[PDB]
Amino acid sequence: EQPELEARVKEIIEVDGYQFRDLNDNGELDPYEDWRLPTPERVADLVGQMSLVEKSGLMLINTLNAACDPQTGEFGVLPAQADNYINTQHMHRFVFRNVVDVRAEGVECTGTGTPVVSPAEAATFTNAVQEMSEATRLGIPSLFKSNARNHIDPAGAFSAFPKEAGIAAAALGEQARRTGEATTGDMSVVADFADVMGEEWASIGLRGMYGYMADLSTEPRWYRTHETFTEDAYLAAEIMETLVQTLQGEELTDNGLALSPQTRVALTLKHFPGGGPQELGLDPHYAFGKAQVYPAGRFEEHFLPFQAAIDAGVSSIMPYYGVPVDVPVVGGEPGETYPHTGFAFSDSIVNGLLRDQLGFTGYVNSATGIINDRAWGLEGNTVPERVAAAINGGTDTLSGFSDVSVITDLYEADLISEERIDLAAERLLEPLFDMGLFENPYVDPDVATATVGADDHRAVGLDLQRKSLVLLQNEETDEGPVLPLKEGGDVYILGDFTEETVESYGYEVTNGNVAEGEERPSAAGSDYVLISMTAKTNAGDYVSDDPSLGLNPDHGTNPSVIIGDDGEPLPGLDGQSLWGAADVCVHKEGHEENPSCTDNRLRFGGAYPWESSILDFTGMEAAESWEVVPSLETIQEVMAEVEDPSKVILHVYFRQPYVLDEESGLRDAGAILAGFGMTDTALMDVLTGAYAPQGKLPFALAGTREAIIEQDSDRPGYDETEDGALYPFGYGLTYED
Ligand SMILES: O=C1O[C@@]2(c3ccc(O)cc3Oc3cc(O[C@@H]4O[C@H](C(=O)O)[C@@H](O)[C@H](O)[C@H]4O)ccc32)c2ccccc21
Ligand SMILES: [Zn+2]
Ligand SMILES: [Zn+2]
Ligand SMILES: [Zn+2]
Ligand SMILES: [Zn+2]
Ligand SMILES: [Zn+2]
Ligand SMILES: [Zn+2]
Ligand SMILES: [Zn+2]
Ligand SMILES: [Zn+2]
Ligand SMILES: [Zn+2]
Ligand SMILES: [Zn+2]
Ligand SMILES: [Zn+2]
Ligand SMILES: [Zn+2]
Ligand SMILES: [Zn+2]
Ligand SMILES: [Zn+2]
Ligand SMILES: [Zn+2]
Ligand SMILES: [Zn+2]
Ligand SMILES: [Zn+2]
Ligand SMILES: [Zn+2]
Ligand SMILES: [Zn+2]
Ligand SMILES: [Zn+2]
Ligand SMILES: [Zn+2]
Ligand SMILES: [Zn+2]
């Protein structure tokens, strides 16, 4: 019965033969400290003793990163804003963004930037925050959330896995290697990944997540396909179910939430109802990309993975910035559409669709910056007006908003009722109770050291890397198929290959990667050419109100149209405006003097908006804000110096569903693999035949720019286009014989 209790400032108290934490420092036992009672009654007693500001502080979540002071050699101290957030704003939810790794010798604390911290230092930092939390009047604990950390970027000491779509490829491939079928995948691969991440996250006291993403990659021009699992809703549904079961547990409360003291990481699933179907792929972080469109009528299909995650008891939901355009209200009086505002502001979306229609009984966490920067559809409204609209729309905690004053001022003005703040407070405290943090909110920094990156954990990651690789093309030469490689030979490498690691498999290696200014050795005479290639955006120069860029008529107009609920188009989104005209710096709607641009530097990712359809390697080589790595020109030189292109092996990182266009000559390679992040050891283990590739594509690939521009943003595949798919969902070759 008795759970372990740790208390670093408040006192433990003996009652009825059991021990309890005395968090309000009166000395005797309140029902909220009494872990023998059901959680609703602990909540009831806690919210009853709370001041208004104390309850409003729960409705904020903000970045709280570890810092370093250059003078004791301590990394993992509290940042500048730690006292203000906790003691003035009364916050208990935080976003932890530091890279966790072992720092190189010679590294002191620099200036700004988010410092790298070790597992033990990270757990020390979060413990120190928990200590300051327990030091609050009622000793309510804190919750840390974080974005993903366990994936290779083609993190730190966390065990490295392929990206999300790599994990789906491995799941589908493994189902295929047993059943001969690739539908919803073998979820043991997903569970095996989530078991490692859960243990490592929990070990540093990181008990909550911004994610995972249930978004569907049905629009290939969306830069965020780099972190989607698949374009298929049914496979997404299966992956979210498995993630929640494994990371949150299978023990559901009577409120229907998978929350126990054995919950390792509570998920804040994103981005509800589905961030996938972005018009022209433009992302609603930016003002030109507010709109989500549903030409194929698949609004219901996109929230299907959220249904599955809600039914498995996911703890939290983050709505996206997007504005649904002309979307029929689900379970609604006919002819009714959802508001043309961001999802977090529409009561019909958050309370109506999410809670009433889909049955979600947890709390809602806004995407970051919706109040100041991305209150889409509320451009003329003020900050307090936007805050009231989101809370009253059904959002319980605001990310990136740290001014609790605004919430209290709205209550004293009867713009938010005390019933609403009480209802938010109940929902935000419920998971902290069930997760057992009122009993023990601390972690052992030395066990983090023994957990983060454990040998067996990295092995599961290595296995998943090798199983995620997808063989798309393996030509049959007169000597047999190109892959697996034969033992020995002269190998030319181009791209992100580490020469000595390729030499290590018994090959003589010529390195085509030379600094600019040197000669590149010719690939003539090579038995094998290995090219590891990808494309990246390069849009950091974008400026919304610059007449050279965002306001350049030679860059065209923004076709996106969003009619306000007032009947007049949103600024810059009438279907005829310059690309930059939707940014607040240009339209200046709203209560502020000369507002900064929200879109400058496209700093979250994505291409120049007028280049978002250029996913073909030939197009991307010529584009302003795309780059092919290594350059396609160099790849084409290389493929020609060897003459027989059947000796070229292309490993492609499809960060987005890039298009192998016939004009580029890439299809002429003897082998083509799709990789989703892996060590060179794992790629070489498969190339040389120690393991056979078995991954299957979790999204379709097109062969023409025309197919990209023609496909429905909300529809998977390319079967409705004239040119169709180059490779379908579920496709993947293996070694035979
Ligand atoms: O415009 C502001 O910039 C940020 C920002 C600023 C500094 C910094 O170092 C990081 C930083 O990260 C983000 C990240 C964002 O991404 C969204 O939110 C989540 C998140 O990570 O937070 C993700 O889980 C969601 O998938 C994603 O859709 C949005 C805004 C900001 C911000 C924070 C607070 C107020 C305003 C802003
Ligand atoms: Zn008693
Ligand atoms: Zn007490
Ligand atoms: Zn005391
Ligand atoms: Zn009250
Ligand atoms: Zn106070
Ligand atoms: Zn508090
Ligand atoms: Zn990426
Ligand atoms: Zn099921
Ligand atoms: Zn959009
Ligand atoms: Zn304030
Ligand atoms: Zn210890
Ligand atoms: Zn312990
Ligand atoms: Zn372990
Ligand atoms: Zn053969
Ligand atoms: Zn040698
Ligand atoms: Zn012109
Ligand atoms: Zn230009
Ligand atoms: Zn307007
Ligand atoms: Zn004003
Ligand atoms: Zn040249
Ligand atoms: Zn045509
Ligand atoms: Zn599509």
- Using a 10 angstrom Cβ sphere, with 0-12 exposed, 13-18 middle and 19 or more buried, the burial of residue 112 is exposed
Residue 430's closest CA among 140, 170, 144? Answer: 140
Place of tokens 């023994």: 450
How many Cα atoms are found within 13 Å in the side-chain-facing hemisphere of 82?
A: 19
Distance 139 CA to ligand 7 centre (A): 7
- Separation between Cα atoms, residue 689 and residue 693, nearest integer Å: 9
Point out the ligand 1 atom lying closest to the alpha carbon of residue 95: 22
Q: How far is C-alpha 146 from the geometric centre of its chain's CA atoms? A: 10
What long-range pairs does 508-517 form, CB within 8 A, spacing at least 24?
512/630, 512/634, 512/638, 513/630
Place of tokens 């993403």: 213
Pairing between strand 67-68 and 75-77? Answer: antiparallel
* H or E segment to which residue 476 belongs: strand 476-477
- Using a 10 angstrom Cβ sphere, with 0-12 exposed, 13-18 middle and 19 or more buried, the burial of residue 206 is buried
Token pair belonging to 35: 């872990």
CA Rg value for the chain: 27
Residue 703's closest CA among 670, 672, 669, 657? Answer: 657
Distance 234 CA to ligand 8 centre (A): 24
Ligand nearest to the CA of 611: 18
How many Cα atoms are found within 13 Å in the side-chain-facing hemisphere of 52?
A: 13
Which residue has the CA at smallest separation from atom 1 of ligand 1?
Answer: 369
Place of tokens 């709280």: 64
326: number of Cβ within 10 Å = 12
- Separation between Cα atoms, residue 65 and residue 95, nearest integer Å: 7
Place of tokens 């400290």: 33
Residue 373 CB less than 6 A away from ligand 1: yes
- Separation between Cα atoms, residue 733 and residue 349, nearest integer Å: 42
Strand partners, 725: 702
Residue 669's closest CA among 535, 530, 536? Answer: 530
Which residue has the CA at smallest separation from atom 36 of ligand 1?
Answer: 369
Residue 597 CB less than 6 A away from ligand 1: no
Point out the ligand 1 atom lying closest to the alpha carbon of residue 114: 9
- Using a 10 angstrom Cβ sphere, with 0-12 exposed, 13-18 middle and 19 or more buried, the burial of residue 219 is buried
Which residue has the CA at smallest separation from atom 8 of ligand 1?
Answer: 63
Residue 270 CB less than 6 A away from ligand 1: yes
Pairing between strand 508-511 and 93-95? Answer: unpaired
- Separation between Cα atoms, residue 344 and residue 396, nearest integer Å: 10
Which spans in 180-232 are helix H? 187-203
Residue 476's closest CA among 180, 733, 683, 662? Answer: 733
Q: With contact defined as beta carbons under 8 Å apart, do 118 and 75 qualify?
A: yes
How far, CA to CA in Å, does 586 sit from each of 379, 502, 571, 598?
12, 52, 9, 10
Token pair belonging to 284: 């609603």
- Separation between Cα atoms, residue 572 and residue 562, nearest integer Å: 9
Token pair belonging to 619: 């197009």
Distance 405 CA to ligand 19 centre (A): 28
- Separation between Cα atoms, residue 721 and residue 732, nearest integer Å: 22
Crossing angle, helix 383-393 and helix 404-412, to 10 degrees?
80
- Separation between Cα atoms, residue 720 and residue 737, nearest integer Å: 37
Point out the ligand 1 atom lying closest to the alpha carbon of residue 374: 1
Residue 436's closest CA among 259, 299, 634, 656? Answer: 259
The answer to whether the Cα torsion of 497, 501, 503, 507 is positive or negative is negative
- CATH code of the domain covering residue 121: 3.20.20.300
- Separation between Cα atoms, residue 713 and residue 217, nearest integer Å: 9
Ligand nearest to the CA of 368: 1
Amino acid (one-letter) located at 720? E
Strands (E), 26-158: 60-63, 67-68, 75-77, 93-95, 143-145
Strand partners, 494: 531
Q: With contact defined as beta carbons under 8 Å apart, do 550 and 572 qualify?
A: no
Place of tokens 């076709």: 559
Residue 148's closest CA among 69, 265, 292? Answer: 265
Distance 544 CA to ligand 17 centre (A): 18
Q: How was this structure determined?
A: X-ray
What long-range pairs does 7-14 form, CB within 8 A, spacing at least 24?
7/134, 8/130, 8/131, 8/134, 8/442, 9/131, 9/134, 9/135, 9/139, 10/134, 10/135, 10/139
How far, CA to CA in Å, does 723 sit from each of 68, 222, 364, 709?
55, 20, 42, 11
DSSP secondary-structure letter at 30? -
- Separation between Cα atoms, residue 515 and residue 7, nearest integer Å: 57
403: number of Cβ within 10 Å = 17
- Separation between Cα atoms, residue 453 and residue 156, nearest integer Å: 9
Residue 402 CB less than 6 A away from ligand 1: no
Residue 268 CB less than 6 A away from ligand 1: no
Which residue has the CA at smallest separation from atom 10 of ligand 1?
Answer: 63
Q: With contact defined as beta carbons under 8 Å apart, do 165 and 230 qualify?
A: yes
Domain region containing 339 = 93-455
- Separation between Cα atoms, residue 84 and residue 423, nearest integer Å: 25
Ligand nearest to the CA of 27: 3
- Separation between Cα atoms, residue 316 and residue 93, nearest integer Å: 13
11: number of Cβ within 10 Å = 11
Amino acid (one-letter) located at 256? G
Residue 399 CB less than 6 A away from ligand 1: yes
440: number of Cβ within 10 Å = 16
- Separation between Cα atoms, residue 416 and residue 394, nearest integer Å: 11
Strands (E), 543-597: 561-563, 569-574
Place of tokens 């003035």: 88
Residue 502's closest CA among 531, 542, 539? Answer: 531
Ligand nearest to the CA of 83: 6
Q: Which of 97, 146, 368 to mutate to test the pocket of ligand 1 (most atoms within 8 A of CB)?
A: 368
Transcribe 672-686 into DSSP letters: EEEESS--HHHHHHH
- Separation between Cα atoms, residue 620 and residue 598, nearest integer Å: 25
Place of tokens 């002309």: 326
- Separation between Cα atoms, residue 176 and residue 420, nearest integer Å: 49
Token pair belonging to 75: 């990394």
Q: With contact defined as beta carbons under 8 Å apart, do 254 and 261 qualify?
A: no
Q: With contact defined as beta carbons under 8 Å apart, do 133 and 57 qualify?
A: no
Q: With contact defined as beta carbons under 8 Å apart, do 395 and 342 qualify?
A: no
DSSP secondary-structure letter at 352? I
Q: How far is C-alpha 334 from the geometric centre of its chain's CA atoms? A: 35
- Using a 10 angstrom Cβ sphere, with 0-12 exposed, 13-18 middle and 19 or more buried, the burial of residue 262 is middle
Transcribe 600-620 into DSSP letters: GGGTTS---GGGTT--BHHHH
Transcribe 261-324 into DSSP letters: TT---EEEEEEET-S--BGGG--TTSGGG-EE--TT--HHHHHHHHHHHHHTT-SEEEE-S-EE
Residue 164's closest CA among 220, 101, 214, 234? Answer: 214
3-state SS string for 480-519 = EECCCCCCCCEEEEEECCCHHHHHCCCCEEEECCCCECEC
Check residue 381 and give left, alpha or beta (phi > 0: left; psi -120 to 50: alpha).
beta
Crossing angle, helix 404-412 and helix 418-434, to 10 degrees?
140
Task: Find all residues with CB under 8 Å of 568, minimum gap 6, and list them.
Answer: none
Which residue has the CA at smallest separation from atom 20 of ligand 1?
Answer: 368
Q: With contact defined as beta carbons under 8 Å apart, do 422 and 47 qualify?
A: yes
Crossing angle, helix 233-248 and helix 164-179, to 10 degrees?
100
Between the two ends of the chain, the Cα-to-Cα distance in Å is 58
- Residues preceding chain discontinuities in the chain with C to N over 2.5 Å: 154
Check residue 595 and give left, alpha or beta (phi > 0: left; psi -120 to 50: alpha).
beta
Alpha-carbon dihedral angle through residues 619, 623, 629, 633, given to the nearest 10 degrees: 60
Transcribe 133-202 into DSSP letters: HHTSTT----EEE----SB----TTSPPB--HHHHHHHHHHHHHHHHS--SS--HHHHHHHHHHHHHHHH
- Separation between Cα atoms, residue 362 and residue 424, nearest integer Å: 10
DSSP secondary-structure letter at 412? H
261: number of Cβ within 10 Å = 15
* Three-class DSSP category at 340: coil
Which residue has the CA at smallest separation from atom 24 of ligand 1?
Answer: 210
Query: At residue 281, what are phi and psi to the nearest 5 degrees?
Result: 75, 5
Q: What is the resolution of this structure in A?
A: 2.3
Q: How far is C-alpha 58 from the geometric centre of its chain's CA atoms? A: 24
The answer to whether the Cα torsion of 203, 207, 208, 211 is positive or negative is positive
Residue 728's closest CA among 697, 695, 693, 694? Answer: 697
Point out the ligand 1 atom lying closest to the alpha carbon of residue 210: 24
536: number of Cβ within 10 Å = 17
Q: With contact defined as beta carbons under 8 Å apart, do 531 and 651 qualify?
A: yes
Distance 322 CA to ligand 1 centre (A): 15
Q: With contact defined as beta carbons under 8 Å apart, do 469 and 649 qualify?
A: no
